[PDB]
Amino acid sequence: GHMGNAAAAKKGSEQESVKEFLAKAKEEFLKKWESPSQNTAQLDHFDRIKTLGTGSFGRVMLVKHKETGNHYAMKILDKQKVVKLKQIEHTLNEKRILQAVNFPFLVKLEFSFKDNSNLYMVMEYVPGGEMFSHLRRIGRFSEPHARFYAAQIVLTFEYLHSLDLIYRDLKPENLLIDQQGYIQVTDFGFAKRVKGRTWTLCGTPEYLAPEIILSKGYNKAVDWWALGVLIYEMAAGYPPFFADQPIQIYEKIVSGKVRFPSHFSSDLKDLLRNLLQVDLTKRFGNLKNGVNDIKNHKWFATTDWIAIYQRKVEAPFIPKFKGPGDTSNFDDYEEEEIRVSINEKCGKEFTEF
C-alpha cells in the first residue's frame, strides 16, 4: 500500500488525536457560546490613532489602551446604520462567534462594549495587513509559501466545521498576516452555525461555490471550494475564474472547467481539481474521509500539521514591523469623527451585544 506499518500507525494516531482535540474544543466553545461575555471595557479606555479599514460595515481603527500602551484594532459599527442595512443578526452573530471561538489563526476579541450610538469590538491588532496587499505586490506566492498559508486555513476550517460553523467569507482581502508571518481570520459576518444545509446567497463572486450560484441548499463544502480558489490565487497571482462582470464569472465557475499556469506542480493541480470539483459527491472535504483527503494529499506531504498548529514552523515571509502602532501595512483613509449621541439608539435590538 502507500504506507508501511509505522507510517500508517502514526497517521492513524494523529487523526485520532485530532478527534480528541476537536471534542474538547467543542466543549469549550459551547460554554462561551451559551454564556457570552459583554461590556468588558469602555471607549475612554482607548486613544484613537488611525483608521485601518472602512466599508459598509463601518470602520476599524487602530487604538491604544491608555494604561498598558497596548495597541488594538477597534471595529466600530453605527447601530442605526446596521439596522438600516438589515445587518442586526449578522452583527450580533459575528460578536457572539468571536467571543466564543479560540484558535491560533482566529483573531481574538479582547474587549467589546456599546454606547448610545455605536457597537465596538476591540480585537488584537494584526500589524502585517491583508494577504491581498502582499499577494498583489509580490505577484504570486511560491508553492511552499502558498502551502504554509493553506495549511493554516485547512486547520482553521477543520476547527470551525467541527463547531458546525460555515465560514463563507474566504478571500485574501479577509486574511491578515501577523508579526510572525501567520494568518489571522477576522471577519465572521457571513459565518453561520448550522449543522445541515443553508441557502443564503452571500460571498464574493470569484470565491462562490457552484451550488451557491445555482441557488441550491448548500453545506460546509462551500468552504473547501473556496479554499481551492484561495490556493489557486495564492499560487497563480490571479483566481481560477474571473471576467469583467460577475455573471460571466458564475458561468465559468459552474462550467466544470479550470485551467492552470504551466508552473503549477502536478500535485497542486490534482489537489485543486479535487477542491474545485463541481460535483459535490466528489469534492474533497465532502467525502467519507472528510478533511483527511486534503491533509493527506501529496501536495501537503511536507506539512507538519502539529508544527503549524503550534506555530513552530518558520514563516516564509515576515511583514515589515517598525514597532508597536506601526500601520504601514495598511492603507490610508479619511478620518471621521466618532459621534456618540446623548440619546440611546436601537437599544432593544442590541441588548445581546
Added chain:
Amino acid sequence: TTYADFIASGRTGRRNAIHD
C-alpha cells in the same frame, strides 16, 4: 495571456461581497 486577461477584467483590486 491569462495574466493580461486578469488585468483587463478590472477585478484586480479588492473585491466586494455580493451584499456590498
